[PDB]
């Protein structure tokens, strides 16, 4: 597992690597940040690295990855945002997740 950030004309993009997943996680679009839980996708603390996309002129303040959050086997993603924005999930394949 791992997280990544990039941009396209739609704006800021968060490409997440999900190895060992079948269905889809729980996308929770909040007014502050984003939440993505992956059951049975518990990632190691050695892969919960965060991003530093500060002053990138994007709606995404900064990406933050965190393993444990109080539920066995679950993982969690925190994508801080700012101002009005829209979330768009894309599944190019069974394992690769993206957030435009």
Short mmCIF file of C-alpha atoms in Angstrom, two decimals:
data_model
loop_
_atom_site.label_atom_id
_atom_site.label_comp_id
_atom_site.label_asym_id
_atom_site.label_seq_id
_atom_site.Cartn_x
_atom_site.Cartn_y
_atom_site.Cartn_z
CA UNK A 1 0.00 0.00 0.00
CA UNK A 2 1.05 3.60 -0.63
CA UNK A 3 -0.24 7.10 -1.39
CA UNK A 4 0.60 9.58 -4.16
CA UNK A 5 -0.34 13.08 -5.30
CA UNK A 6 -0.41 14.81 -8.68
CA UNK A 7 -2.52 17.20 -10.73
CA UNK A 8 -4.47 17.27 -13.94
CA UNK A 9 -6.84 19.77 -15.56
CA UNK A 10 -9.59 18.64 -13.12
CA UNK A 11 -7.14 19.90 -10.41
CA UNK A 12 -5.45 17.94 -7.60
CA UNK A 13 -5.36 14.17 -7.74
CA UNK A 14 -4.57 11.59 -5.06
CA UNK A 15 -3.45 8.27 -6.55
CA UNK A 16 -3.60 5.57 -3.87
CA UNK A 17 -2.07 2.10 -4.27
CA UNK A 18 -4.36 -0.62 -2.92
CA UNK A 19 -2.73 -4.05 -3.17
CA UNK A 20 -5.00 -6.83 -1.95
CA UNK A 21 -8.39 -5.13 -2.25
CA UNK A 22 -11.49 -6.24 -4.16
CA UNK A 23 -14.53 -4.08 -3.49
CA UNK A 24 -14.44 -0.34 -2.84
CA UNK A 25 -13.54 1.65 0.30
CA UNK A 26 -15.80 4.08 2.16
CA UNK A 27 -15.51 7.57 0.68
CA UNK A 28 -16.53 10.28 3.15
CA UNK A 29 -16.42 13.77 1.65
CA UNK A 30 -16.29 16.25 4.53
CA UNK A 31 -16.17 20.05 4.59
CA UNK A 32 -12.75 19.83 6.24
CA UNK A 33 -10.97 16.77 4.84
CA UNK A 34 -11.62 13.37 3.25
CA UNK A 35 -11.93 9.87 4.70
CA UNK A 36 -11.18 6.54 3.03
CA UNK A 37 -11.42 3.24 4.92
CA UNK A 38 -10.27 -0.08 3.45
CA UNK A 39 -11.46 -3.17 5.31
CA UNK A 40 -8.82 -5.90 5.45
CA UNK A 41 -6.36 -3.39 4.00
CA UNK A 42 -4.45 -2.57 7.18
CA UNK A 43 -1.27 -0.85 5.99
CA UNK A 44 2.05 -0.77 7.90
CA UNK A 45 3.26 2.39 9.63
CA UNK A 46 6.17 2.28 7.19
CA UNK A 47 3.79 3.23 4.38
CA UNK A 48 1.62 5.82 6.13
CA UNK A 49 3.89 8.59 4.86
CA UNK A 50 2.27 11.98 4.26
CA UNK A 51 2.55 14.43 1.36
CA UNK A 52 3.93 17.97 1.33
CA UNK A 53 2.00 19.53 -1.56
CA UNK A 54 1.89 22.94 0.11
CA UNK A 55 1.30 26.06 -2.00
CA UNK A 56 0.66 23.87 -5.05
CA UNK A 57 -2.28 26.07 -6.05
CA UNK A 58 -4.75 23.21 -5.55
CA UNK A 59 -7.92 22.48 -3.53
CA UNK A 60 -5.99 19.78 -1.67
CA UNK A 61 -4.17 21.26 1.33
CA UNK A 62 -2.07 18.15 1.95
CA UNK A 63 -2.42 14.37 1.83
CA UNK A 64 -1.96 12.36 5.03
CA UNK A 65 -1.83 8.58 5.38
CA UNK A 66 -2.52 6.78 8.66
CA UNK A 67 -2.66 3.07 9.48
CA UNK A 68 -4.36 2.33 12.81
CA UNK A 69 -7.57 4.16 13.60
CA UNK A 70 -9.24 1.92 16.18
CA UNK A 71 -10.82 -0.75 13.97
CA UNK A 72 -9.13 -4.09 13.31
CA UNK A 73 -7.87 -4.57 9.74
CA UNK A 74 -9.13 -1.12 8.54
CA UNK A 75 -7.04 1.68 7.02
CA UNK A 76 -7.72 5.38 6.82
CA UNK A 77 -6.82 8.30 4.56
CA UNK A 78 -6.90 12.02 5.37
CA UNK A 79 -6.92 14.47 2.47
CA UNK A 80 -7.18 17.99 3.88
CA UNK A 81 -8.90 20.47 1.56
CA UNK A 82 -9.87 24.14 1.37
CA UNK A 83 -12.73 26.26 0.04
CA UNK A 84 -15.43 24.78 -2.18
CA UNK A 85 -14.41 21.63 -4.05
CA UNK A 86 -15.66 18.32 -5.45
CA UNK A 87 -14.48 14.74 -4.96
CA UNK A 88 -14.22 12.27 -7.84
CA UNK A 89 -13.14 8.65 -7.37
CA UNK A 90 -11.76 6.66 -10.30
CA UNK A 91 -11.01 2.93 -10.51
CA UNK A 92 -8.71 2.19 -13.45
CA UNK A 93 -8.33 -1.34 -12.08
CA UNK A 94 -9.11 -3.68 -9.15
CA UNK A 95 -6.53 -2.31 -6.74
CA UNK A 96 -5.65 1.18 -7.97
CA UNK A 97 -7.68 3.98 -6.39
CA UNK A 98 -7.70 7.66 -7.35
CA UNK A 99 -9.27 10.87 -6.05
CA UNK A 100 -9.65 13.87 -8.36
#
